[PDB]
Amino acid sequence: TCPFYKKIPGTGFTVDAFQYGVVEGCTAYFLTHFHSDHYAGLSKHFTFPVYCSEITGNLLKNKLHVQEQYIHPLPLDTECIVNGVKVVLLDANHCPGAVMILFYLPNGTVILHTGDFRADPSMERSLLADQKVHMLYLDTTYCSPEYTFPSQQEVIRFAINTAFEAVTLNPHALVVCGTYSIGKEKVFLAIADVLGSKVGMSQEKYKTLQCLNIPEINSLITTDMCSSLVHLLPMMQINFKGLQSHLKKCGGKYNQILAFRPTGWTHSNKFTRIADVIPQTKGNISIYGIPYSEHSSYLEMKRFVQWLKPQKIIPTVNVGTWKSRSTMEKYFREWKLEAGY
Numbered sequence: 001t002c003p004f005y006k007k008i009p010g011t012g013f014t015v016d017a018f019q020y021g022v023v024e025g026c027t028a029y030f031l032t033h034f035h036s037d038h039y040a041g042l043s044k045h046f047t048f049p050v051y052c053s054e055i056t057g058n059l060l061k062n063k064l065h066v067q068e069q070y071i072h073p074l075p076l077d078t079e080c081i082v083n084g085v086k087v088v089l090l091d092a093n094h095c096p097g098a099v100m101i102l103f104y105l106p107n108g109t110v111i112l113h114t115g116d117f118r119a120d121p122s123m124e125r126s127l128l129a130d131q132k133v134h135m136l137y138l139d140t141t142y143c144s145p146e147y148t149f150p151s152q153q154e155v156i157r158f159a160i161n162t163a164f165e166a167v168t169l170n171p172h173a174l175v176v177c178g179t180y181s182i183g184k185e186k187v188f189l190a191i192a193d194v195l196g197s198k199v200g201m202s203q204e205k206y207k208t209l210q211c212l213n214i215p216e217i218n219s220l221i222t223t224d225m226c227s228s229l230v231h232l233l234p235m236m237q238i239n240f241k242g243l244q245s246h247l248k249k250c251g252g253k254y255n256q257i258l259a260f261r262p263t264g265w266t267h268s269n270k271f272t273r274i275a276d277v278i279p280q281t282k283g284n285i286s287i288y289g290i291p292y293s294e295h296s297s298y299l300e301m302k303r304f305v306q307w308l309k310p311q312k313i314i315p316t317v318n319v320g321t322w323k324s325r326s327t328m329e330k331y332f333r334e335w336k337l338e339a340g341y
C-alpha cells in the first residue's frame with residue numbers, strides 16, 4: 001500500500017506511486033521522472049490520468065506503451081490548474097524530463113516536491129523566489145557531510161581531456177561508456193564531440209535517446225557501430241571480461257579500450273581529487289570510475305534548504321532505518337538554527 005510521503009494532503013494527488021495498485025482517493029498520478037524506482041508499475045494497461053513533463057510523456061508512450069489518452073504533459077515554468085488545484089513544474093537538474101512540483105493547496109498551504117534533484121543556485125531565481133513553502137518533500141540521497149563530489153563541468157573536462165589524449169596517442173583505440181538508465185548523457189556526448197565521432201549504441205538505447213528533445217540529436221548518435229569509435233554498452237558489461245568480449249566483435253579495427261563508468265559518489269571521493277583519478281588496467285583495457293552525480297551534494301542541499309526556509313521537511317530517500325532518519329533530522333535542525341528560520 002501507498003506510503004504517506006508519496007501522498008499530497010488536501011488533494012486527490014500522489015507522486016511516483018504506480019506500484020501500489022489503485023490508490024484510494026487518487027484522481028491524478030504525478031510522475032517526476034523516468035527512472036524505474038519511480039515509474040514502477042506503469043504499462044499499456046494503465047487507465048488513470050498521468051501528469052508529467054513532455055519528455056517523460058514521450059518515454060511513457062514509446063517505451064512503456066501507455067495510451068496517449070491518459071498522458072497529460074505540462075509545460076515548465078507555467079501555472080496550470082489540475083482537478084481544481086494550481087500546480088507548477090520546475091526543472092529538477094536531474095535526468096532529461098525530470099521535474100520538481102509546486103502545489104498551491106486550496107487551504108493556502110504551499111508544498112514543493114523536489115522529486116530527484118541536484119540543487120543549484122539558479123533555482124533561487126525560478127518561480128520559487130516569490131513565495132513561502134510550508135512543506136518540502138526532499139531528495140535526501142546524499143544528506144551527510146561525507147558526501148562530496150566535483151561539479152559536472154569539472155568531471156566532463158576530465159573525461160574529454162582523458163579520451164582526446166588517449167585517441168591522439170593511439171588512433172586505433174576505442175572508447176566505451178556504460179549506461180543503465182536515462183541521465184548523464186553529457187558524458188558520452190562530450191567525448192564523441194571532441195573525437196569527431198557519432199556515438200554507437202543498440203536499437204533499444206537509440207529509441208530511448210530519440211524521446212529526449214536533445215537539439216541536433218540525429219547528428220550525434222547512430223545504430224551503425226562500425227561507423228563510430230565511441231560505443232555505449234550496458235553498465236554490467238563495463239568490466240575486463242565484458243570489454244575483452246566486446247573488442248573481439250569489432251573485427252580487428254581496434255587494439256585498445258578506454259572505458260568510463262559513471263557512478264555517483266564512491267568512497268574514493270573521500271581522498272582523490274578529480275584531476276588525480278587513475279584507472280584500473282589489465283593489458284590493453286583501462287576502466288575509469290568518474291563521479292558524475294545527478295543528485296545534490298550535502299553542501300548543495302544545505303544551501304538550497306537554508307535559502308528556501310521551509311516550515312517542515314519530509315525526506316523521500318533513506319527513510320527505512322531509524323539511524324538514517326535520526327541523522328537527517330539532526331542536520332535539518334542544525335541548518336535551521338544556523339540560518340535563523
Ligand SMILES: Cc1cc(=O)oc2c(CN(C)C)c(O)ccc12
Pocket residue numbers: 169170255256257283284285
Ligand atoms: C596497442 C596499445 C594498447 C594499449 O593498451 O595502449 C597503447 C598505448 C597507450 N600506452 C602508451 C600504453 C599507445 O600509446 C599505443 C598503443 C597501445
Ligand code: NI
Pocket residue numbers: 033035094116
Ligand atoms: Ni532518479
